[model samples]
Target: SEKLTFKTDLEKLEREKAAQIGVAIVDPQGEIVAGHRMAQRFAMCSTFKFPLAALIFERIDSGTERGDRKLSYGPDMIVEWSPATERFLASGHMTVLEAAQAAVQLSDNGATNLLLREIGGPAAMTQYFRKIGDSVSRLDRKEPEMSDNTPGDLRDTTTPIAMARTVAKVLYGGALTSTSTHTIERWLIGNQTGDATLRAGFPKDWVVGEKTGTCANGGRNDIGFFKAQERDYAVAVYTTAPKLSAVERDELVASVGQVITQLILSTDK
Candidate 1:
């Protein structure tokens, strides 16, 4: 087989980007096809919900917790980014699966915080990640605290390598039980949150399941799996554009996705 390759003008891309960006792409066979700044860490923002939700599913799968368990909304659970969740919470309560879905598919902060509290908060999430063999990533606090840490917060963060590997494990490896894996994949496939990043790069026929994150300053990220040409690839692009506006940061992310997609599709020929 001819060696597959992807060579972009990443030097120029990053030079003009005026941001700190990290990206990684893993083939179905767990090969690092192309990447830049894979070891650099950035604020996870909403992306933390990916692994947090996974931990919840892991508990559910192990009979340590129940998805149908209910919890009521409280002041501590309230967050600013999720209007839909606010309306849902107006009903006073929600099920575990419902809250998890909101966190993954809609990036609902309130639901995330609720689930975090239910699962023993960020410390437990950090421990779960550690139990799974990751040490570079950590979830330190709830989203409200994270958002309010606008004075250059660095609490909840992960590297592109960690993010991409976690997705690969959940999607292909036995990181989660079969039932839990399927449930998580369903949420990922149904995600309606990330449109301007990796989601914006693929064609209509391709399948891309992803989660997006944005925070104060310039943290913008998308991590997920892309299925094309009968091949599945996991990718993570986390960026911090302290010098650029939100519009520019989004465009930078989208361009990176386009390049990665071109690289993947090109290999099919």
Candidate 2:
């Protein structure tokens, strides 16, 4: 069957690249069209930001949180790869919406930490996922520690299929209000950080929104949606290759994404 072919090809690609990968492409009907290692867990890294944004947006939708309020963080909270937070170092604060945008768009470490604290940290995020029916994804720590990607550790990890389903839920599950969904979508659509991963595999004309994660080890992920005309799919690709460099990790994910796109173009033929 076509589905098996997709799985094998992706597996072969992973083998050829000397990486471990988990990929899932979920149809609009919430069916798994194709996947490789879909159920296996991989470190989520900064990819955790979008769901954090979702929780924040949901709070906004319910009037529990003010988007315009200033979120203050100390200089000590800033970590490596925190461009957004670094920019606000002198002032030590950013609006709640701006913090969410920074967390989602730039993977800002300090902003992500601040937002996590705003939403009550790892336990609260795990609770949000459980409420949405996802138990395969768990948030055990904050940004830098979460991305540790230790060899035998499972902290802050998500299965590809679980994340794919959650993305679909956030976008179409009716849990998030329309404004919240579109606001998250818009943030990911304009993401400036994921150009070398999943987005690299697709033609520029396709409507794609993805969130990426980079680990202190060698984990790379791109999770979100790809809309080709009216037909759209949620793609969750997560990989770990500590033996490879940063660029190679991107290629590993990009290669997986390339096959996913090609399969979609011919799935109906």
Candidate 3:
């Protein structure tokens, strides 16, 4: 609403936070509502679980796998930030769907690696995105390892627009079977990790489902959609700042949503 456009406003925030912020808000039909550094790449962090969830769902939907079947993981499978599966060492097993649910909804590292094993490996997950038409997205390493934010290193990274378009294609372009699609929707809709970031900036009127990624080295991301009036707008916000603290990263993402929502709700979107 001021002299600066959306791009400049977002850039101002980027400058203030000493971070590189890449944002893309895209409609399902391939329209760009807003883009700021959307082509720049950043570490994907924990956000890679969504496609892994879809892959696991596809296996189950095709009858190759059973959601109710129990899978076991040992202390070796557990990694840092594994809230959901760490306790499973005591129980020694959990259902397939439980792994997918915790991976997407809770961003659990233990559950994520557990699903990665079931779906094949990191390359299989990368191949899944390739099969669906995302050339720029990739996952070359496993959790915690993949979160390595080495300066200028491109491993386990994706551009904002590329990831957003990939998500939009999967969610709206029918890249997935109906059964798999609906299953992922439920996990993302109830995402347990998005409260203070992207979710904090959105309004109560729209239905929001999102997944966020955070790295120990100050890589933060939140990707999802705002659905209103039967239309879905995919959002991809990624920032890399070695200087930002935990709360600062959340506020940076929340500010992006705050700026975007005011423009979005005023229009037909």
Please report the TM-score between candidate 1 and the true structure: 0.90
lDDT of each: 0.79, 0.86, 0.84
By the TM-score metric, which is better: model 1 or model 2?
2
Better of 1 and 2 by lDDT: 2
Q: Relative to the unseen true structure, what is the Cα RMSD of model 2?
A: 1.4
Q: Sort the predicted structures by TM-score, highest score first.
A: 2, 3, 1
**RMSD to native for every prediction?**
2.6, 1.4, 1.9
Q: Can you write out model 1's per-residue Cα lDDT over 26-70, one digit (the tens) per residue?
A: 875556867778887678888878888899988888888998888
Instruction: Tell me the deviation in Å of residue 240 in model 1.
Output: 1.3
Q: Please, what are the lDDT tens digits per residue for candidate 3 over residues 87-130?
A: 77789987898888998998988898887887788999889888
Enumerate clash totals for all models, in the order shown: 0, 0, 0
For candidate 3, the 10 contiguous residues with the lowest summed lDDT are 1-10
Runs off by more than 4 Å, candidate 3: 1-4, 266-269
Q: Could you tell me which 10 consecutive residues in candidate 1 have the lowest summed lDDT?
A: 1-10
lDDT of 1 at 105: 89
Per lDDT, what order, best first? 2, 3, 1
